[PDB]
A paper describes a structure:
We purified the binary complex of human LGR4 and RSPO2 using gel-filtration chromatography from a mixture of individually purified LGR4 and RSPO2 (residues 20-143, Fu1-2 domains). We determined its structure using cryo-EM at an overall resolution of 4.0 Å. RSPO2 Fu1-2 domains exhibited an elongated form comprising multiple β-hairpins stabilized by disulfide bonds. RSPO2-bound LGR4 structure is almost identical to the apo LGR4 structure with an overall RMSD of 0.40 Å, indicating that RSPO2 binding does not induce any conformational differences in the LGR4 structure. This is in sharp contrast to the ‘push-pull’ activation mechanism of related LGR1-3, in which hormone bound to the receptor sterically clashes with the membrane, causing an upward movement of the ECD to avoid the clash, resulting in receptor activation. Upon RSPO2 binding, LGR4 undergoes no significant conformational changes in its transmembrane and extracellular domain structures or their relative orientations.
Leucine-rich repeat-containing G protein-coupled receptor 4 (LGR4) plays a critical role in regulating the wingless-related integration site (Wnt) signaling pathway and is essential for organ development and carcinogenesis. LGR4, along with its ligand R-spondin (RSPO), potentiates Wnt/β-catenin signaling by recruiting its signaling suppressor, E3 ligase Zinc and Ring Finger 3 (ZNRF3), and inducing its membrane clearance. Cell surface-expressed LGR4/5, members of the class A G-protein coupled receptors (GPCR) family, have an extracellular domain (ECD) comprising 17 leucine-rich repeats (LRRs), followed by a seven-transmembrane domain (TMD), and an intracellular domain (ICD). ZNRF3/RNF43, LGR4, and RSPO form a ternary complex on the cell surface, which relieves ZNRF3/RNF43-mediated suppression of Wnt/β-catenin signaling and thereby potentiates pathway activation.
Numbering used by the authors:
A (entry chain A): 26 to 476, 520 to 822
B (entry chain B): 40 to 143
Write the structure that this text describes.
């Protein structure tokens, strides 16, 4: 390395780097030939007079981050070759005009981030070579018009991060050579009608983060303007003719603004404009004219009351690439033939209702297209015929009853959620490139599984091939259907064919079995429906789910299943009353009362099945058509509603039995006939309780997130335990009750006699 | 980590001083932010209320640029006219070599 004065280094070629040394005074021992000096990141607090006498040839001087506070006015005497001066990160608090008076050759002055509040009027006098100026991050409240009036050669000026709020007229009337002006992040809210007059060479203006509530008319005198930014402001109204005076604009920034109304002809005759984004223009209802604007690349209009689209859009714009018109009131779609450069279209949340065949005739570069949340109910079968590399499509939340498929082999993302009226299935041969898919009904996802994220998931609750699934599961439902039906119908004939005075104990046994038969016929629906759709349940799954049959089957299942519980406990009170009347009265006169009480349970069960009809989708939770899988408050909160009484019911009908058990004496059951009746009923309450836990215990699993249960096991136990009491109940009356034995003998004589 | 309010080893400096410029330093597959008193060549400062970050000079063929579209000085062979890089001076402007810019 070239020799240099310690402790700092010298690059050579009259370049000296003595920055970051913690010094508080100007370094010495440097050759007068030096042209550049950097002594930043030091502790030089104050500049003594003639600090740079032995150094005539500098052009670069750096003083950033030195906590400078005072400079001697003559400390910079003799430096006539300086061009660039950096004085940021200090505590000047004021521009040292006197010290910089003799800097004739200065071109770039940096004075930002120094807590400057005000400047003298005679500042910058004689600075004939100045071109750039850093004046951001200070406490300036007024624009130093008079000091700035003496810099005709200035080109770049920034006044960011300052407390400037108002700009008077002719604030920069002498800045002929000015090119770019920065004013972002300031407290400006008012602008005079002629604040910017004279800036004929202005190209770039920035006004972001200000308080302009009204659009300034002073901009109309900026013929050379090319880029304007005033986003993140309080602008609300863009009147027509605002951009009359600046016909060479290229890029604009107006987002993050409370704009409501926009002039109809505001943006016309702007050839060089490239982007256009409007959001929040609620008061706008008419399409802004675009005559004279033929180079827009991106067009976006959101939150407007625009109803129609002019037909000349695709014939005027040529290189338009991305178009968005969401959040509006568009009803009809004009012909899009011509927009060859178009690539993406978004028309979500509009009043469109139909799609015509020619609506997308001319599109060749389309890749992404969205129509979510519209009123579409019909689509032409050849609507997507004349399309090329279409990749992403979304028409979710609509009312299609069908879906054309031709010309969609290149699709990758497809979304159909919300189309409740769509029923048919989609062939996989047409969607070989499909990757992500969402459909209104899970059974539609059965074809595309590859055994490709298809939603909603086709879980075990909604199988595709086999309804029951497991072969050994399948036999049990077939097994239970036969035994339950045959025995149930048999016992009814025993009791009701005898023209004898039926007691209460015999009666209640009849109704439960009568009600129980409905489980058998309900299970028969399941085994038959599974058999018909053997290995092909998916195709019938959707129709069966939404069809009226599932409602009937669902209503049938809940009715009798509840009917048993709301009625078996009637036997308990009857048995207790009969037991109590044995040693109290010896006879029962409540038979009519029980007959009355018998019917009310059926109606109570009837309203249990009617309730899911009020809230649509309650029965449609699963193809099993049995409110049990996790659902939604209407259904979810309903599902817990049924089980709570039955679980509650299983406390009472037990305690009186225990209460009577303590009450009765042990020898009382030795030979009395009521022992047979009381012992028989004791078993139905025994089984119906224990077999009701697994269905009840599994229903609370979604409320207990600590335990996760596999859906296949979830479905399995319901298919084997929920209707299990149906088959089991008549077996006890047919193989254990001695009373039925004599009843079977009674009808045996009756059939032979007849 | 020099002059950094919150510096690490992998992420490097995560937040410089309130007035000091924060620049993301990328070295091959290793990248970490750091603190620099001013933007280096090919970069222009962007003062913001939250914090200050170095911004690459998008302006073509420019060594150091003043702002988004204004260049302090371009490279050799590309003259300076209104802060722009031009191989030759346009009509009405004469070439200048020693100080490398356009003149009348």
């Amino acid at each position: 390395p070239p020799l240099c004065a310690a402790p700092c280094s010298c690059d050579g070629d009259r370049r000296v780097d003595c920055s970051g040394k913690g010094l508080t005074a100007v370094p010495e021992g440097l050759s007068a030939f030096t042209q550049a000096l950097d002594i930043s990141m030091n502790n030089i607090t104050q500049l003594p007079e003639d600090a740079f006498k032995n150094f005539p040839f500098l052009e670069e001087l750096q003083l950033a981050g030195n906590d400078l506070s005072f400079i001697h006015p003559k400390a910079l005497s003799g430096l006539k070759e300086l061009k660039v001066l950096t004085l940021q990160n200090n505590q000047l608090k004021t521009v040292p005009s006197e010290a910089i008076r003799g800097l004739s050759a200065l071109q770039s002055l940096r004075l930002d981030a120094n807590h400057i509040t005000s400047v003298p009027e005679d500042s910058f006098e004689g600075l004939v070579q100045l071109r750039h100026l850093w004046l951001d991050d200070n406490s300036l409240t007024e624009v130093p018009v008079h000091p700035l009036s003496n810099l005709p050669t200035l080109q770049a000026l920034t006044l960011a991060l300052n407390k400037i709020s108002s700009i008077p007229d002719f604030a920069f009337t002498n800045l002929s050579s000015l090119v770019v002006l920065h004013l972002h992040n300031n407290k400006i809210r008012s602008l005079s009608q002629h604040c910017f007059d004279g800036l004929d060479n202005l190209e770039t203006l920035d006004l972001n983060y200000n308080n302009l509530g009204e659009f300034p008319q002073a901009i109309k005198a900026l013929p050379s303007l090319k880029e304007l930014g005033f986003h993140s402001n309080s602008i609300s109204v863009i009147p027509d003719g605002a951009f009359d005076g600046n016909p060479l604009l290229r890029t604009i920034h107006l987002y993050d603004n409370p704009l409501s109304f926009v002039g109809n002809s505001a943006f016309h005759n702007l050839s060089d404009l490239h982007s256009l984004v409007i959001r929040g223009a609620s008061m706008v209802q008419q399409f802004p004219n675009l005559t004279g604007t033929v180079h827009l690349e991106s067009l976006t209009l959101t939150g407007t009351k625009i109803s129609s689209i002019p037909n000349n859009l695709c014939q005027e714009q040529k290189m338009l690439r991305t178009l968005d018109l969401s959040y509006n009131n568009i009803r009809d779609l004009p012909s899009f033939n011509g927009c060859h450069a178009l690539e993406e279209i978004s028309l979500q949340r509009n009043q469109i209702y139909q799609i015509k065949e020619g609506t997308f005739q001319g599109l060749i570069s389309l890749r992404i297209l969205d129509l979510s949340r519209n009123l579409i109910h019909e689509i032409h079968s050849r609507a997507f015929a004349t399309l090329g590399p279409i990749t992403n499509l979304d028409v979710s939340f609509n009312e299609l009853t069908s879906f054309p498929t031709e010309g969609l082999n290149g699709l990758n993302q497809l979304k159909l959620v919300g189309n409740f009226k769509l029923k048919e299935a989609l062939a996989a041969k047409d969607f070989v490139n499909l990757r992500s898919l969402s459909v209104p009904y899970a059974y539609q996802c059965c074809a595309f599984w590859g055994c490709i994220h298809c939603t909603p998931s086709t879980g075990a609750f909604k199988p595709c091939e086999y309804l029951l699934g497991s072969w050994m599961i399948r036999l049990t439902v077939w097994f239970i259907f036969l035994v339950a039906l045959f025995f149930n119908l048999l016992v009814i004939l025993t009791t009701f064919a005898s023209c004898t005075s039926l007691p209460s104990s015999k009666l209640f046994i009849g109704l439960i079995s009568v009600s129980n038969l409905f489980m058998g016929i309900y299970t028969g629906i399941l085994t038959f429906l599974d058999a018909v759709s053997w290995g092909r349940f998916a195709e019938f799954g959707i129709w069966w789910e939404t069809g009226s049959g599932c409602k009937v089957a669902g209503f049938l299942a809940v009715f009798s299943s509840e009917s048993a519980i709301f009625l078996l406990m009637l036997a308990t009170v009857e048995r207790s009353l009969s037991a109590k009347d044995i040693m109290k009265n010896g006879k029962s006169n409540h038979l009519k009362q029980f007959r009355v009480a018998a019917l009310l349970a059926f109606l109570g069960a009837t309203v249990a099945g009617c309730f899911p009809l009020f809230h649509r989708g309650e029965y449609s939770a699963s193809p099993l058509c049995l409110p049990f899988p996790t659902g939604e408050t209407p259904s979810l909160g309903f599902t817990v509603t049924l089980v709570l009484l039955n679980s509650l019911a299983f406390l009472l009908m037990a305690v009186i039995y225990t209460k009577l058990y303590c009450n009765l004496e042990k020898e009382d059951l030795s030979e009395n006939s009521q022992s047979s009746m009381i012992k028989h009923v004791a078993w139905l309450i025994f089984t119906n309780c224990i077999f009701f836990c697994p269905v009840a215990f599994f229903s609370f699993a979604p409320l207990i997130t600590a335990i996760s249960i596999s859906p296949e096991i979830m479905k399995s136990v319901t298919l084997i335990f929920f209707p299990l009491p149906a088959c089991l109940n008549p077996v006890l009356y047919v193989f254990f009750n001695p009373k039925f034995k004599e009843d079977w003998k009674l009808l045996k004589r009756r059939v032979t006699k007849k | 980590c020099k002059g950094c309010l919150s510096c690490s080893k992998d992420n490097g400096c995560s937040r410089c001083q309130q007035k000091l410029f924060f620049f993301l330093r990328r070295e091959g597959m290793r990248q970490y932010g750091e603190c620099l008193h001013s933007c280096p060549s090919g970069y222009y400062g962007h003062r913001a209320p939250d914090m200050n970050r170095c911004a690459r000079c998008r302006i073509e063929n420019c060594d150091s640029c003043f702002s988004k579209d204004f260049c302090t000085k371009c490279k050799v062979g590309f003259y300076l006219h209104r802060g722009r890089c031009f191989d030759e001076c346009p009509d009405g402007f004469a070439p200048l070599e020693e100080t490398m810019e356009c003149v009348e």
